[PDB]
Enzyme design. Structure first.
Site, PDB file in Angstrom:
ATOM      1  N   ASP A   1      28.718 -57.077   9.443  1.00  0.00           N
ATOM      2  CA  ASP A   1      28.438 -56.042   9.580  1.00  0.00           C
ATOM      3  C   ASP A   1      30.090 -56.120  10.383  1.00  0.00           C
ATOM      4  O   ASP A   1      30.749 -56.512  10.178  1.00  0.00           O
ATOM      5  CB  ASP A   1      27.653 -57.115  11.331  1.00  0.00           C
ATOM      6  CG  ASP A   1      27.679 -55.689  12.050  1.00  0.00           C
ATOM      7  OD1 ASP A   1      27.557 -55.080  12.200  1.00  0.00           O
ATOM      8  OD2 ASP A   1      27.802 -56.643  13.508  1.00  0.00           O
TER       9      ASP A   1
ATOM     10  N   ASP B   1      31.175 -54.211  13.929  1.00  0.00           N
ATOM     11  CA  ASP B   1      31.526 -54.592  15.280  1.00  0.00           C
ATOM     12  C   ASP B   1      31.368 -56.029  15.904  1.00  0.00           C
ATOM     13  O   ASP B   1      29.722 -56.041  15.952  1.00  0.00           O
ATOM     14  CB  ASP B   1      30.608 -53.555  16.065  1.00  0.00           C
ATOM     15  CG  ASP B   1      31.096 -51.874  15.955  1.00  0.00           C
ATOM     16  OD1 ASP B   1      31.933 -51.933  15.628  1.00  0.00           O
ATOM     17  OD2 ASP B   1      30.091 -51.051  15.883  1.00  0.00           O
TER      18      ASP B   1
HETATM   19  O1  LIG Z   1      27.022 -52.678  23.991  1.00  0.00           O
HETATM   20  C1  LIG Z   1      27.027 -52.673  23.022  1.00  0.00           C
HETATM   21  N1  LIG Z   1      27.191 -52.693  21.647  1.00  0.00           N
HETATM   22  C2  LIG Z   1      26.580 -51.760  20.259  1.00  0.00           C
HETATM   23  C3  LIG Z   1      26.017 -51.058  20.809  1.00  0.00           C
HETATM   24  C4  LIG Z   1      25.589 -49.863  19.686  1.00  0.00           C
HETATM   25  O2  LIG Z   1      24.961 -50.576  18.634  1.00  0.00           O
HETATM   26  C5  LIG Z   1      26.071 -50.247  17.626  1.00  0.00           C
HETATM   27  C6  LIG Z   1      26.870 -51.273  17.060  1.00  0.00           C
HETATM   28  O3  LIG Z   1      26.761 -52.518  17.800  1.00  0.00           O
HETATM   29  C7  LIG Z   1      27.159 -49.077  18.414  1.00  0.00           C
HETATM   30  O4  LIG Z   1      27.401 -48.018  17.476  1.00  0.00           O
HETATM   31  C8  LIG Z   1      26.264 -48.990  19.072  1.00  0.00           C
HETATM   32  O5  LIG Z   1      24.996 -47.573  18.992  1.00  0.00           O
HETATM   33  C9  LIG Z   1      25.307 -50.292  22.025  1.00  0.00           C
HETATM   34  O6  LIG Z   1      24.879 -49.285  22.133  1.00  0.00           O
HETATM   35  N2  LIG Z   1      25.991 -51.032  23.051  1.00  0.00           N
HETATM   36 MG   LIG Z   2      27.520 -55.962  15.404  1.00  0.00          MG
END
Ligand SMILES: O=c1[nH]cc([C@@H]2O[C@H](CO)[C@@H](O)[C@H]2O)c(=O)[nH]1
Ligand SMILES: [Mg+2]
Length: 226
Positions: free
Chosen positions: A12, A14
């Site tokens: 992954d 993020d």
């Molecule tokens: O707090 C948040 N984290 C992650 C996302 C979403 O997931 C993806 C990565 O974790 C990112 O692209 C977003 O869509 C979100 O909407 N709110």
């Molecule tokens: Mg992640």
């Protein structure tokens, strides 16, 4: 189930390789606050790993925000564009990635982020992201839904040359939706969760760690750190 050896790794992005989840949190908290709602860990747990529009719709439904998902994505992305380029590499990420590359262990990235978002987030870490064998994004034509649908990890594994059996792939994830997608794909999974996530959401993975720094590659039949 004890850890079994693997040959291919899938990461992954993020919250796992980059410290971008705190950026989302700030922008969503700010938006939620104007409606007297709190963007809390319970809500965040539902949406990490989802595609942006999917996440937005969940936030809206759970917090009863008076907007459309398209409106929430547009506003939030507009704000995030200013801060995404400042994304920093998570602890242990560089050490692990360089080790894999040195020992010729194939690895790849599978992120629900779209193209523009990925470009912004990785714009200042190009040398790190160049070491991945390939990348699957959330706007890839083969990925119909975000995690916990296994689509993105299955697509990612099928693009290695030659393609491994799914059971020889190891996913690294920070999010519950991502652990579930890895299990649904038939893959083992290392979770590196934020400690604020619930016990129920952090007890499903093959191995759960406080940091990538604590990962011991030999547990999965990979070369130890020199
Ligand atoms: O707090 C948040 N984290 C992650 C996302 C979403 O997931 C993806 C990565 O974790 C990112 O692209 C977003 O869509 C979100 O909407 N709110
Ligand atoms: Mg992640």
């Amino acid at each position: 189930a004890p850890p079994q050896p693997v040959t291919h790794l899938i990461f992954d992005m993020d919250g796992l390789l980059l410290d971008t989840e705190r950026l989302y949190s700030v922008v969503f908290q700010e938006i939620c606050n104007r409606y007297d709602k709190k963007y809390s860990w319970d809500v965040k747990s539902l949406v990490m790993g989802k595609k942006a529009l999917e996440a937005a719709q969940i936030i809206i439904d759970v917090l009863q925000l008076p907007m459309s998902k398209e409106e929430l994505v547009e506003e939030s992305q507009t704000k995030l564009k200013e801060v995404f380029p400042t994304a920093a590499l998570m602890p242990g990420a560089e050490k692990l990635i360089i080790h894999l590359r040195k020992h010729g262990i194939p690895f790849a990235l599978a992120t629900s982020s779209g193209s523009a978002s990925f470009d912004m987030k990785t714009s200042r870490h190009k040398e790190f992201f160049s070491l991945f064998s390939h990348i699957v994004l959330g706007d890839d034509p083969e990925v119909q839904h975000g995690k916990p649908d296994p689509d993105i990890f299955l697509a990612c594994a099928k693009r290695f040359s030659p393609p491994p059996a799914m059971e020889k792939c190891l996913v690294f994830e920070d999010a519950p939706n991502g652990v579930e997608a890895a299990l649904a794909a038939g893959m083992q999974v290392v979770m590196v969760p934020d400690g604020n996530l619930s016990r129920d959401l952090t007890t499903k993975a093959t191995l759960v760690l406080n940091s990538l720094q604590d990962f011991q590659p030999e547990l999965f039949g990979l070369p130890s750190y020199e």
